[PDB]
From a paper:
In this work, we characterize OsChz1, a sole gene encoding CHZ-domain protein in the agronomical important crop rice to gain knowledge about the function of CHZ-domain proteins in higher eukaryotes. Molecular and biochemical analyses reveal that OsChz1 is broadly expressed in various tissues of rice and the OsChz1 protein binds both H2A-H2B and H2A.Z-H2B. A concentration-dependent efficient nucleosome assembly was observed, and this occurred significantly more efficiently in the presence of OsChz1 than in the absence of OsChz1 for both H2A-H2B and H2A.Z-H2B. This observation is in line with a histone–chaperone activity of OsChz1 that facilitates nucleosome assembly. Thus, similar to yChz1, OsChz1 also plays a role in H2A.Z deposition into chromatin.
To understand the molecular basis of interaction between OsChz1 and H2A-H2B, we crystallized OsChz1-C in complex with H2A-H2B, and obtained the crystal structure of the complex at a 2.85 Å resolution by the molecular replacement (MR) method. As supported by the 2Fo-Fc electron density map, residues 432–446aa of OsChz1 are well ordered in the structure. The N-terminal half of OsChz1-C forms extensive interactions with H2B, through residues located at the α3 and α4 helix regions. Last, the C-terminal half of OsChz1-C inserts into the acidic pocket of H2A, formed by α2–α4 helices. The side chain of OsChz1 Asn444 forms H-bond interaction with H2A Tyr59 and the side chain of OsChz1 Glu446 is recognized by H2A Leu67 via van der Waals interaction. Our crystal structure analysis of the OsChz1-H2A-H2B complex showed that OsChz1 binds H2A-H2B via an acidic binding surface. Mutagenesis unraveled that the OsChz1 residues Glu432 + Glu433, Glu436 + Glu 438 + Asn439 + Asp440, or Asn444 + Val445 + Glu446 all are functionally involved in the OsChz1 binding with H2A-H2B as well as with H2A.Z-H2B. Next, we mutagenized the key residues of OsChz1 involved in histone binding to examine their function in biochemical assays. It was observed that all the three OsChz1-C mutants exhibited ~15–26-fold decrease of affinity in binding H2A-H2B as compared to the wild-type OsChz1-C. The H2A residues Tyr59, and Leu67 involved in binding with OsChz1 in the OsChz1-H2A-H2B complex are conserved in H2A.Z, likely providing an explanation for OsChz1 in chaperoning both H2A-H2B and H2A.Z-H2B. At nucleosome level, the OsChz1-H2A-H2B complex structure predicts that the binding is located at the disk face of the nucleosome where the C-terminus of OsChz1 prolongs into the acidic pocket of nucleosome and the N-terminus counteracts with the C-terminus α2 helix of histone H4.
Author numbering:
A (entry chain K): 24 to 104
B (entry chain A), D (entry chain E), E (entry chain C): 17 to 104
C (entry chain I): 25 to 104
F (entry chain G): 25 to 103
G (entry chain B), J (entry chain F): 59 to 144
H (entry chain J), I (entry chain L): 60 to 148
K (entry chain H): 59 to 146
L (entry chain D): 60 to 147
The structure:
Amino acid sequence: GLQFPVGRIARFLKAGKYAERVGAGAPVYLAAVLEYLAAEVLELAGNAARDNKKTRIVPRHIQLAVRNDEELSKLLGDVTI
Amino acid sequence: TSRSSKAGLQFPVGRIARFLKAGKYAERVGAGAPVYLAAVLEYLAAEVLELAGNAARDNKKTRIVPRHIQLAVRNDEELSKLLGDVTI
Amino acid sequence: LQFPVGRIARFLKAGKYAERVGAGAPVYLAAVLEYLAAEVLELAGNAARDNKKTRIVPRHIQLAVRNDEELSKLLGDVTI
Amino acid sequence: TSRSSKAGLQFPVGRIARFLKAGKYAERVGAGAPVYLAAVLEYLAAEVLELAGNAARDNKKTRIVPRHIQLAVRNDEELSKLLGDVTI
Amino acid sequence: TSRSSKAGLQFPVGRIARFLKAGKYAERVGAGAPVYLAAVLEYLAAEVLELAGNAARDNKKTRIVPRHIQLAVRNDEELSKLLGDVTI
Amino acid sequence: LQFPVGRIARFLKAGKYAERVGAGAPVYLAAVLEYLAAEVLELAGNAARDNKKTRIVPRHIQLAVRNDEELSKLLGDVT
Amino acid sequence: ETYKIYIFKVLKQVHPDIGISSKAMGIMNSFINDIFEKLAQESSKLARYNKKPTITSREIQTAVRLVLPGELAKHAVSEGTKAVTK
Amino acid sequence: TYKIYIFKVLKQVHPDIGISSKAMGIMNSFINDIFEKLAQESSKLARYNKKPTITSREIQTAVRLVLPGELAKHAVSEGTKAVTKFTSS
Amino acid sequence: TYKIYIFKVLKQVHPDIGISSKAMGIMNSFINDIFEKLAQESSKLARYNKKPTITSREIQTAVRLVLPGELAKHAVSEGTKAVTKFTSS
Amino acid sequence: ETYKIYIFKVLKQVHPDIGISSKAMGIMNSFINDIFEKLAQESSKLARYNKKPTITSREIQTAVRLVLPGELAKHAVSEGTKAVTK
Amino acid sequence: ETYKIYIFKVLKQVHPDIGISSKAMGIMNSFINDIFEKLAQESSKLARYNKKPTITSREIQTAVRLVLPGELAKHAVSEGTKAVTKFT
Amino acid sequence: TYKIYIFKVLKQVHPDIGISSKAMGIMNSFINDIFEKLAQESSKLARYNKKPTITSREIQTAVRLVLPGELAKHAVSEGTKAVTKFTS
Amino acid sequence: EEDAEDDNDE
Amino acid sequence: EEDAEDDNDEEVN
Amino acid sequence: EEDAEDDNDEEVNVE
């Protein structure tokens, strides 16, 4: 199932003074959302490596993948490299 | 949903959370609270039931009755403080 | 010994064979079940290996159990 | 006692199991009991021995004698209740 | 560097080790001592702060003052014995 | 950096050497033993290159010890 | 309504070979009721006074809605509602 | 549902051999069968025997009754852990 | 980092694929960015709300205040483990 | 039969550099004897009265003998016995 | 000089939304100093009477120097100083 | 036997390389030799050094003597864990 | 909004 | 009855 | 008997 680190996100969530009080839901939920994005993005990146014929991922792959996705570009901006 | 199991519990995290909001204790309740509170209620339930059962056996029974519960609480230094003397 | 003694323990109170169970019981039981899961799975393997394969499917156990006198008496016929 | 090691223990699970049948306390004894009981007797042994050693050192000795044990038990709230006054 | 981190601690193992030789408490110190002692001083710090804060809230405050510590210690059976009445 | 410190602690603590052992001792000790093993186990492979194996047998260690000045002063002549 | 079935489940864990009478189970059930009220009443007193902002999974979700666009927020809000439900 | 543990006994008499999509279900199906068979035998026997037995429940009850305070809780803790190791080793 | 975990999310859609020394640092950067965005958005919203919240800090304080002695410590322990399972599931 | 060796092993664990006199070791040994008796006697009281069936390994083994045929029983009784023993 | 910084870190772990006055932080600091002194002073009383040899890492290092020759000694004294300070 | 750790140390520089049933026993024999030589060296030095040492035993005996009740046992517990982290 | 469970994906 | 250790086997079937 | 940290090695591994 989900592999992101929730313990860590919980301590960043109080370490940057976003708030002083945080429900234990808050980091569980956040971790899930971040992990979803690391998923969707990395999916496309591998696919970019399909029409490249590779077993690696390199910056150009993500760059392609982001910008082609209209969703992601509005979220992470054009990928620099 | 498996919130109770996820927390390692037999007591019902969901319903407890509902009671917390249903009862108007607060508008907002963090997800940790009903987990935590259920765990504590289970703990106390098991401490009483261990003692009340141990009372029952020591008294040659295989079934807990009010007296056993009362004796259990009355001879525990901590438990009495919480409850008071158990009635009947 | 790979079998799940904790689980076997909690099945052992859940079906009411008894209400009281010695901690010897689930340990011993789990060992027995595992022996049987060994001496069956071994024989299936031979049948596949004594017949050019590297996967076990229902016929192999079938052949295995059927072939063995001790086992057929224990679990009967196998039905794919 | 091969299974003493298996439980995490210095005390002899086999002999304790033997003593339980030997002493006519019950005919049948589950394998959990002597394991459990050996652990309890080791826990107690180690509690009393930690405290009596601490007593010895506090008294500048490097060897436990009956007085050290007595003091240790006297000065512990729970241990005294179990044993009583240790008798030299 | 990182000795405290390696022992699961916020308290400063190195400085405590230094304090022990600086203080001429002994000539030679084993590496376990300062770690152990730091862990103990943290534990107490944390126990006292948990209570004094719980007192601050129970008294509708969001910041600990001397009274809260004094009360926290008075109301704990163990803590009073190390400390005594906190002086404010 | 892996080796069994708790085990080294056991042996060391046993009272043959001393009754009191600082927890510094078995950590340090384990790490020194480990280095030596690493330095020796290195050379066997290097020595094995000019034997051409992906395996190490006693002669390889034997080769390596003897050829190393420092190590043969520490250990014996390997059998 | 009642904690009885859970009390019973706990009971079978600690003393599998021992039962419990009606009046006895009713005492257990009040006892947990009465502790639930005590802890809740007190917690709300603590909550009520505290003036400081709290980030809970509600504030995070509303955030994911406001910052992830379209298909990304829908799906993000599923993955998190799923994770905090178990 | 002893699917994962059967898996593991296979890997240790025949490591690079595999198992069916439904052959695991068969294998799992007969563990259940013999568990239920033995368990029922164990039950008939146990009811039939009728001699008092001392298990760890008795030891734990006794410990709580005799030992005072937290000392008793510590001893029950050590007891319980010792049984678990014995059971889970 | 979130690198080790990005490593792992890769394997759940492309195990065959690896990832370059710098493509990782880019994945890392994205994660930080959205974290920092969601967090700061969460913070505005939180500041805005102004209603009383019960979290497990309040439960734990209630517990120490109402429960006596060691019973209180044992219960805070069980409360704290249950929340830790829940979070770290 | 004495618990002194075990007592002494436990001693060397908690206080490796401290010894113990004969009189002191005899106090320790009686103490453990006396707790064993108390626990044992109390345990017996609590078993004596309990009339409910118990499944111990002795019942499981008889079961295996009864239900497994031939080779299969003698070999099952090995694997089980070994597990119970070590 | 002051544990104040570390005390504060422990505070924010426990009661992240609660602060502490100067007068109070001073009490806390003072309390940790007193405990340290009591523990160190008693630890010393107990070190000083004990007459028996102790192998610390100072003795192991000197042993490595005395037994390992040359480069091995300089390098072995590194891997072990690296392991006992958690340096990197 | 230290064979397994040696295997892992092999892998640290030679992952591909294997090691023979008898060639392990040689590696094993070196480690024992040098354990012994250094151990014995350490002993001689330790017997020579004769200055009072504070190890964690002193800290733990201090802690038990000075701290009251369960607070003492909680503290000993946190201290023992913290040395063990640092150890393993 | 709440954490309503009408927000899952089949 | 009897959980005797007469019943271990080394090197059989 | 000394335990300084000047005895640490960031220098290259030697033969």
